[PDB]
Amino acid sequence: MPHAFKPGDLVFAKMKGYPHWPARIDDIADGAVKPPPNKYPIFFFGTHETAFLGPKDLFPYDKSKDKYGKPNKRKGFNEGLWEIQNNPHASYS
């Protein structure tokens, strides 16, 4: 049975106006800005952007990749598909 989201989990993350996007739950570094309550720091593969999202916008990657894991014309998306498949836990800073 599922647990709560934890750093390192792989997802497709939904933002308004964007397709479900390959991403991971990030850690928060000591001394770094924390997310709002009930939100997680989401790192988006390909764009390498961070936004704060709740579970309603987070789709576990294994279950969802057949639906969401196809190339998309949007900037950074296809690079993102490569990262989540091939090195999802690397440093992208």
Report the candidate in 21, 22, 59, 56 with the shortest Cα–Cα distance to residue 38: 56
* CA 68/CA 22 separation, integer angstroms: 8
Resolution (A): 1.5
At position 82, the amino acid (one-letter code) is W
* CA 57/CA 44 separation, integer angstroms: 13
- Tokens 């933002």 identify what position? 15
HSE of 67 in the Cβ direction (CA atoms, 13 Å)? 11
CATH of domain 10-28+39-85: 2.30.30.140
User: Domain segments of the chain: what residues?
Assistant: 10-28+39-85
* CA 51/CA 67 separation, integer angstroms: 22
Q: Residue 13 has which token pair?
A: 């993350």
Query: For residue 13, with 0-12 CB atoms within 10 Å meaning exposed, 13-18 middle and 19 or more buried, which class applies?
Result: buried
Report the C-alpha dihedral over residues 9, 20, 67, 2, rounded to 10 degrees: 30
At position 7, the amino acid (one-letter code) is P
